[PDB]
Amino acid sequence: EVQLVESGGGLVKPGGSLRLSCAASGFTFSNAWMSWVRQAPGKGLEWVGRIKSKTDGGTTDYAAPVKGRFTISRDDSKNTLYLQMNSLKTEDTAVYYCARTGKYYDFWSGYPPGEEYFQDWGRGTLVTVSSASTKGPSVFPLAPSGGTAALGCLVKDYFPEPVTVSWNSGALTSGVHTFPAVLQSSGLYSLSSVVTVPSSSLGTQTYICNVNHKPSNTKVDKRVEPK
Amino acid sequence: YELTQETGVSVALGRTVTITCRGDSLRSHYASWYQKKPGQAPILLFYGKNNRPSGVPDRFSGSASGNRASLTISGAQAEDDAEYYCSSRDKSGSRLSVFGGGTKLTVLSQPKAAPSVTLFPPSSEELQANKATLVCLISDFYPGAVTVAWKADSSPVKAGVETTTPSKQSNNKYAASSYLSLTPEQWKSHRSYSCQVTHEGSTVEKTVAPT
Ligand SMILES: [Zn+2]
Ligand SMILES: [Zn+2]
C-alpha cells in the first residue's frame, strides 16, 4: 500500500549541489512527518533531518554534520519530499532514504518526550561525492612468499568500475579469487585478485594477471614472480 | 556508535536467536527495530515493549532490560536473512534518533567455513613509486560476516584502512578484503603489522614485517 520512491542520486563534485526527491503514495502525506536517513558505504544508519506536517509547524530539524548545507522541504500538492544538498563533502557519500515517521512514548522523564520510529521507507538512492574522473589502474604484483602458494595482483586507483582480471589469458581459473573493489575517499577504486598454485610450479610456470579497464581502454598484463 | 550491536549472528532453521543492542541510553529509553534485506527498503519490525506493525511475522518480538534492547526471532525462517538495526533517542536528550551499527543475521543453509586469510606486504614496485599498501585478502567463509582490525607494534591502526563488505563468490562462499595505506617510511619504521579477521567471535590473525 505505502510506497516511497527516492530519486535524484548521482555523482557530484565536492562543493557542488544535488536535489533529491521522494514521491509518496498510499497514505495521507499532508498529515505525515517525514525524514531523511542516510547510510555511508560502510557505517550504518544516520538521521539527516525531518520536516513536520503542515497542521503542525511544518518546521524542519537537521543533524549537526549537515546543518547550514542541507534544506528539507515538501510539496503536499504533489505528495513529494525534497532534500536540497549544497556544498557537498566527500563525507556526504551515502545511500539516502526517505521515511515516514511516527511517535511513541516510553518511560523517559525528559522533555520534549517521545521516541521517533521510521514507519515506512524507500529503497534509497545512491549519492557519490567525488572529484574522480575516468582513470585507468596501476597494477602491482603480490608475490608468493601445504604445498601451495598464493600470489596475486593489486589493481590500484581506477575509475569508474569495473575492471576485469584474468590469469594466463583465461587458461588459469582453478583457485582464482577476484575480490570486490574498495571505494577510497579519493573516489577511486582498488581491487585485488589472487590465485593459489602448487608451490612446486613456482619458477617453472609463469603466472600473468591480465587487467582490462574498458572505460580507459587499458589492457595491461603483469608477471607475478617469486621473491 | 552510541548503540552497539554485534556484526553478525547465525541461527539454524527453526531455532531461536536474539540480537542485542547495548547503550547507556537504553537504561532510560525504548528502542525500535528494523530489518533490511540487500537492496530493499528497511521495514519496521517492532518498537517499544509490545508494538508489532501489521504484517510483521509473529516470530519477531522485542524486549528490554538494563542497558540492553533485544530482538528475538522465535523460529528462524530462510527469508529472515537480513541486516537488523536498533534505534533509540540520542543519549543527549536531543530530538534525534540514533542507530546501532547493524547485525547481519544468517539463517544457516550450508556448513560453516572459516575465513582463509592472506596478508601481502607492499610490493617493491609500489614502494619505488613512493607508496605502500598492505593487502589483507579474506576468502571462502560462511556465514558472510567478518570484522577486520589492523595493528602495528601492538597498537590499533585506524587511519588509512578501507574494508569491503563481504560478497558472495561463484562457489557460494563469501570474500572480503581490507587495505592499509601507509607511507613507505611508515611501513619501514614499525616491527610488524597484523590483520585480524573475526568470524562469529573467532579471530584469525596474519602478520607481515618489513624485511
Ligand atoms: Zn525515549
Ligand atoms: Zn568461523
Residue numbers in the entry:
A (entry chain H): 1 to 52, 52A, 52B, 52C, 53 to 82, 82A, 82B, 82C, ...
B (entry chain L): 2 to 9, 11 to 95, 95A, 95B, 95C, 96 to 106, 106A, 107 to 120, ...
Quote the authors verbatim.
One such antibody, the 10E8 antibody from donor N152, is perhaps the broadest of all HIV-1 antibodies thus far identified. The 10E8 antibody recognizes an epitope in the membrane-proximal external region (MPER) of the HIV-1 gp41 transmembrane glycoprotein. Like other MPER-directed antibodies, the 10E8 antibody is able to recognize its gp41 epitope in the membrane context, a trait that it appears to acquire during maturation, as this trait is not present in V gene-reverted germline versions of these antibodies. Here we combined an additional round of NGS from the same January 2011 time point with structure-function studies of germline and mature 10E8 antibodies and of their maturation intermediates to approximate the developmental pathway for the 10E8 lineage.
X-ray diffraction data from these three structures extended to 3.05, 1.70, and 1.60 Å respectively, and they were solved by molecular replacement and refined to Rwork/Rfree of 18.8/21.5, 23.7/27.1, and 19.4/20.9% for ligand-free mature H and L, gHv/gLv, and gHv/mature L versions of 10E8, respectively. Electron density for an unknown ligand was observed adjacent to residue Ser 100c in the CDR H3 for the gHv/mature L 10E8 Fab. Differences were also seen in the gHv/mature L structure, though in this case, the CDR H3 was fully ordered. Thus maturation from germline to mature 10E8 affects the structure of the CDR H2 and H3 regions, and these structural changes occur primarily as a result of somatic hypermutation of the heavy chain V gene.
